[PDB]
A paper describes a structure:
The solved structure contains two molecules of [name] in the asymmetric unit. The entire structure consists of two β-helical domains of 3-solenoid connected by a linker. Each of the domains is composed of 12 coils, which each contains three strands and three loops as observed in GH55 exo-β-1,3-glucosidases. In [name], the catalytic site and subsite −1 are formed by Glu-140, Gln-172, Ser-203, Trp-552, Asp-557, Glu-591, His-592, Glu-614, and Tyr-617, the aromatic block is formed by Phe-143, Trp-552, and Trp-554, and subsite +1 is formed by Gln-225, Tyr-617, Phe-677, and Phe-678. These residues are spatially conserved well with those of exo-β-1,3-glucosidases. As the plus subsites for the binding of longer oligosaccharides, the aromatic residues suggested in SacteLam55A (Trp-196 at subsite +2 and Tyr-194 at subsite +5) and those on the putative substrate binding groove in PcLam55A (Tyr-135, Phe-199, and Trp-245) are not observed in [name]. The smaller size of C5-L3 in the structure probably allows the localization of C6-L3 appropriately for the formation of the extended cleft and possible subsites.
Here, we investigated the mechanism of endo-type action on laminarin by GH55 endo-β-1,3-glucanase [name], identified from [name].
Residue numbers in the entry:
A (entry chain A): 17 to 187, 190 to 752
B (entry chain B): 17 to 752
Write the structure that this text describes.
Amino acid sequence: STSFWYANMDHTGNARGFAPDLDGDFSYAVYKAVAPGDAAGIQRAINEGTGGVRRHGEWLASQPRVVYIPPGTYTISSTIFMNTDTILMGDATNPPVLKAAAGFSGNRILLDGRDPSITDGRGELSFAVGLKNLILDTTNIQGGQEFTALHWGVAQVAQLQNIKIRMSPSVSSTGHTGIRLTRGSTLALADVRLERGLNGIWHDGHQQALYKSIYFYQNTVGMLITNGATISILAPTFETVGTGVLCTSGAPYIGLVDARSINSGVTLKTTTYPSFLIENLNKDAQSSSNVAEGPSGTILNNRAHVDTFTYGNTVGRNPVYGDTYTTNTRPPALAPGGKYPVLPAPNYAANTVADFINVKDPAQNGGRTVLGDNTKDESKVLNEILQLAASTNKIAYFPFGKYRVDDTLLVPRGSRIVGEAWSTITGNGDKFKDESNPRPVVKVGNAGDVGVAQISDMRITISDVMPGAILIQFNMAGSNPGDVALWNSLITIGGTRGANALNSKCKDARNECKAAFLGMHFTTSSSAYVENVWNWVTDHGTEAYDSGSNIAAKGGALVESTRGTWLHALGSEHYWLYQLNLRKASNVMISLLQSETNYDQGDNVQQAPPAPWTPNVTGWGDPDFSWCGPNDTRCRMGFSNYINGGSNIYTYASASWAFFSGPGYQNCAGEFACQNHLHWIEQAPTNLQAFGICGKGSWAALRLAGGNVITSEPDFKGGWNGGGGGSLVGRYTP
Amino acid sequence: STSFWYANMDHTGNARGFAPDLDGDFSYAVYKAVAPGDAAGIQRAINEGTGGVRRHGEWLASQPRVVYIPPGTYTISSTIFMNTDTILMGDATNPPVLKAAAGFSGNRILLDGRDPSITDGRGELSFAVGLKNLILDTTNIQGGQEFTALHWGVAQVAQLQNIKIRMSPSVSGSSTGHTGIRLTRGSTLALADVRLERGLNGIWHDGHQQALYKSIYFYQNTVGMLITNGATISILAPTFETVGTGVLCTSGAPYIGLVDARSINSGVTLKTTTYPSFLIENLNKDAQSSSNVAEGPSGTILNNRAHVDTFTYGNTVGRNPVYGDTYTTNTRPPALAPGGKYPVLPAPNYAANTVADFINVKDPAQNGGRTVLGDNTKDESKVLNEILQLAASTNKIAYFPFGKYRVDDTLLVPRGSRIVGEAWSTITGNGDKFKDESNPRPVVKVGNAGDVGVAQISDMRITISDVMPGAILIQFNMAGSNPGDVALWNSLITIGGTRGANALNSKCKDARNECKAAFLGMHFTTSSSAYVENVWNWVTDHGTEAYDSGSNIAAKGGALVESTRGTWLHALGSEHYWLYQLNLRKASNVMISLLQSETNYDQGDNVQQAPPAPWTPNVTGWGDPDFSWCGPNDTRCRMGFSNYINGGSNIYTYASASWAFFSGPGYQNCAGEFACQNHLHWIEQAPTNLQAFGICGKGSWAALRLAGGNVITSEPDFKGGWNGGGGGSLVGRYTP
C-alpha cells in the first residue's frame, strides 16, 4: 500500500500489540485494516473481536482497537458509531475521505464519537475515542438541512488529530454543523479545520472543552454555544466567518485568547449574560465589525488589537458584572513573540518505519527481549532501548501492552515516544513504597537536562499500593516550548485491569489506600508542555471487575518549575489533598484545568483529610488543613487550585466540579453546599492573571491569600447550570 | 392484500388524515405503507416527509406517522429507530415478523423505541411511540450473546398492543443472553398484553422511573423480569409459565407490586439481593411450582404456598420494625373484582372487523352525507354529535382519521359507542361556552347521567385551544354492565405544549398571573363506572413542536373521581395541575394499579403565584383543597397534591409514582433532598376499607399525611424508591 509508518509496523508476529487481562484470550487483534473503499468495513473493524465475539463497550484501556483506513473515498450511508478505547487511524500521507452519501438515511450524523452501548446518553463515560488523519465530507447533503458531521459528546482521553471537515455552504435557521458537543466531559479538541456550513462547532451543554488551534474557514457561525459551563478557545483563526462566537443560551465562561480574525464579522456575540475574556485578539482591516455585542448593545467596538478585555464577574469591581480593560506583558519565556505556544500532536506523517525503533523487535532494539504482558520486570531492558533510540535519533514506538517496571524508567534527552492506543507503563514493587523517598515511575530527563522529550498516546499507571510513587516527573527543560511535551495521554490509578494487588487493597472508605505520592511532578528546573492529558484516580470500575475506588493518592499535579510550564486541558481528578498545586512556580500558563473532588470526600466522609496522609508543608508544599476543625469535613476536602506564591501565573479556565458529599454517591445539602473551597490562594503570587475560575457545589468561589473569601453567591454565580450551583470568577487580576 | 380495516381505510382523497399547522404543508401523508418483505422501507416510512424533507423529531402530536406493515417476514440487519408521534401498525389479521438477521451489525438492538434525535439519552421526552400487531424475533442470534429485541426507554403515550417477542433459549451458566424489553431512562406509563418467549430476561427494568406491566405473559424465560434500579414497578395479572425466576431485583430499592399473578411450573416468584419494598397480592400457584414465593438477602421471606392473599415486605405504617413482613386478608368488592380478579382488558385492535363495520367520520357516504373537515378551521360540534349518535345507533365503530376537530360545545359520546383514532386524532374545545367557571362544561362527555352501556375510546387526543376556566376536558357519566364497557385506552388529555392553540399559548406566558386554562382534566361522576388504561393527563411544562410555548398554566384539577361504582385506573398519568393531580371525593370502589404524577414546575418556595390562586377553592361544591392549613406565604405547603383522598370507601391503590423536581419557575433547584414539597400524598378524610400500597414520592418532606393530621415523615424510616431512597419516599403498606 503506502509507506505510512503505522500500517507498516508489525501487527502479526511477536512485535504486535498484545492485550493481557482478557480472560485467557491471547489472540485478540488490536489492529484492524479496512479495505480501500470499503465503507461498511469501518464499523466492522470497530466492533469485531476474537472469534466472532463483539468487543466490550465502555472499557477504558484493556481492549484497545486501532482501525487503519487506507487513502480513498468511503461513501457513508448511515451513522458510524465509535467504541470507547478505539482509534480511527487514517493514512497520514494521504488522509481518507469519509463522505456522507446523497441518500443518507437515519439520524443526520456522519460520525458519533459516543459509544452506543452507554445507557441514557452519558457522554461523560465515553472515554478514549480517537480520530486521526481523516477528512469528513458532507457536501453531498443540501446546505439548508440540519446535519452534523461529527457528534463529540464524549469524555476524557478523546482526541482529534489532523482532522478536516468540509460542509455545504449554509442557506435559514438550519444547516450543517461540524462538531456538535452534547453531554460529555472531554478535555481538548486540537488542530481541526472546519470549512463552511452553518456552525463550525456547536457546544450544546457540554460541561467543558479547550478548543486549541481551530481553523474556522467560511463558517456562518464559528462556534455556536447553546449551553455549557466552561469554554476555552486558544489560538483560533476566523477566516470569512459571519460571527466568531455566538452564545444564545446559558451563562458559561468563554475564553478567547490569541485569536486571529480574517475578513470576519462580530467576534463574540451573546443574547444572554455569560462572562467572557478576549486577550490578544488581532483583527485585519476587512474585519470592521464590533468585537463584542450583548443584549444591551455594543460591548467593545471595532479595534484591530485588543489587550485584556473581560466582561463578567470580576473581583473588586462595582458592579461585579461588567467590562474591564487592562494591558499585560506576557513573559517572553512563557509567550515567545507575545503568543503562547501551541503545538499539534505529532503524527509522523513523513516518517517511515526506518525512522522508528519498535521496542519489541529484537532486530531493532539491540537484540533485547520485550514482552509487554505484565508478567515480569522490564525496567532495565526498556531504559536501555529508550537511551538507544534517543542516541540514534529514532522514534521509540511502543506497541500496545502492559510494560511492568520495578524501577524508574528514564526518558533521556532527545526522546520521541509514541504508543499504540495508549500503551501502558505500570509501576510495581517495593522501590515505590517508601513515602520518605518518593520515586518516579516515568522520569522525563535528569535534573538539569535540556533537550527534546516528546511523548504521545501512552498510559502510565501502578499495579500495587505504592505510597512513594510519582507516576511521571518532569525534570527536563526544552530549548523551545514543546521540546519537552506530553500529548494525548492518561495517568490513572485503579479502574482498569492489570492491578490486582491495588484492586484488593482499596475497598475500604474508612482506610483509603495510599496508592501514590503524586500523579505528576514538575521540578524547579523543568519546562514541560502538556496537552489533553487525564490525571485520574478512579471513581468507578470500567472493565467489568470488582474495582474498588476508595483510594487516597496525596496529590495530583505538583508544579514547582520556574522556567516555564504550559498546561493545555489537563484533567486532574479525585486526588486526596489537591488536584493542582503550584508551589513557588514562576512561569505557568493554563489554558484549561479540569478537576473533580474525590467522591468519598464531603460532609459524610469516613476518613477526614489529610488522613491517611501526614502533610509535609516544608518539604513538599502540602496543604495541612490546619485551618479546619478536626471534624469539619466540608472544610477538609481536596482543592482544585492550590496556588502557593511564585510569580507570572496565568490561568485562563478552571472547570472544577463537586458532586457528592460522601461514599455511595451521597447528595450534598444544597446546590452550593458540597464543598467550601475549591480554589484557594495560600500566598499571593507576583503578577497573577486569573480568568474563568469556575466551580460547582462550592460555598466560596475563590479564597485569597490573606484569608478573604469571595462567596459564590450572590454576585459570583455562573457557569455550571447557569448558576444553579455554579461559580464563576471571570476576572481576578490582583 | 388483506381485509385489515386500517389498511383499507381511505388514505387518499378527502377522508384521509390531515395534519394542520404544518407551516403551509397541506400534502403531508400521515399514512405510509411498507412493501411486503421490504425491511429497509420500515425506517424510510418512519422518517419520510413532504417533498424529501425529513419528519420532525421530538414532536408530540402535530406530525404523526402511522406505518402499515403487511404480513410477511422482514429480515433486519441493524437497529430500527422509532420517532416520537409514530406508530408501527402491523396487519392485525396476520401480524408481520420483524426478524433480526444472522449477521446483525451494530449495537445489538433490533428495535429502539427512543427517538435518536433526542439528545443526551432523555427517554422521558420520547413521547407517543406506538407498536401494534408485531412479532419480534431474535432466534437467528445465538442465545449466549447479549441482545435486546426492544429498547423501551421511552415516555408517556407510548403503547404496546398485541406484541409477541420470540427469543433464543438462554444458555445454562451464562450471565449474558437475550432480553425482550429493556427499559432504560424514561417515564412511560403502561406496557400491555405482551407475550415474551424464552431468552434470559423477558423484561429488564434498568433504571426506568415507573411502569405498569399489565397482562404480561412470561413464557419459558430464565428470568421473568429483571429489575436493576428504578422507583415504582407495578405488575398486574402476569403469567409465569416454566420460568426460572419470576421477578429478580439485584440493584436499587424500588417498589415492586405483584397483583393477580399466576405461576405455572415456575421457580421463585420474587427474589432480591437488595432491600426493596414489595407486595404480593392474589398469587395463585400450581402444584409444580414448589419453590419459595419470596427470597431476600437474609434467606427465605415467604415459603411455598399455592395461594397468597396480601403479603408485604417493606416500609409499613404502624409496624414496630418499619421494614418487615405483614400478612393480611382482604375481601375485594365483587363490583371491583368480579370473580376475585381485577378486570384487565386488552386495547381493541378490531382484528376481525372490516371497513364495513366502521364509519369513517369524514366520508359523506358513510356518516349520513355530512361535511367534516378535521382541519381546526370551524366548529364541528353538531356535525360530530350527529355522526356519533349515528354510529352508536347503528352498532358501527366510529373511526376518526387524524386531524384537529374543533368543537364549540360538548361532544357527547352516546350509549353503544366505539371510537378509535388514527395516531391520536384530536378533539379541541373552544368558545365562550367553556369559559364560565360557575357552569363548567365537558369538552368530551362520555354518556349522560345514569346511562349504562358501552363507550370505548382508544388512540385519541382531547385538548383545548384557548383559556377556558370552565372546561372539563373529559367527563365520564355512564357505567358499564361489565368493567371495561366504558373504557379509555392509549390516549392523551393535554393542555398546551402543542400547535393549534395560539390563543391559549399567548395568554399563559406570565408566572405571576397563571392562566386559568381549564377547570378539570378528567371527571368521574357519582353514577359512573369507567375503565382507564395508559392515559396521559398533562398540563404542559415545555413546548414540544418548535413554537412559542406558553407554559405558565393553572389548570385547577387533574382527575376528580366521585364515582361510587367501580372505577379502575391502570397507569393514569396526571401531571402539572394546580391544586391536585388525582382527587378521590367520597368515591366508592376504586382500584388504581399505577398513578404517575408530577407537581407543577412553577410551584415551590420560589413560586410567583401561591396556590390556590388564581383559583378560589370550592370545597362544598367540588371538593377542592383550600390550603387553609398553610400560612398565606408558606409556599412549600401550598403545592399541588398528587394523592388527595377525601373519605369514601373501598379504595385500593397499588402504586403511586409521584415526583416533585423544582422549587419555582426556571427549573430552580430545591432546598434539599426532601425539601421540594411538604405533602405529596394527603388523606383528608379516612375512607372505610382503605388499602394503600407503593406510595412513592420524591423530594417531599412527608411520605403520607393521615386524616387526623398525623404526618409520616420520609426520614428516617420511609426512604426508598426514587434514587434508592436518596430523596425518594416509599410507603410500602398503609392498611388501617
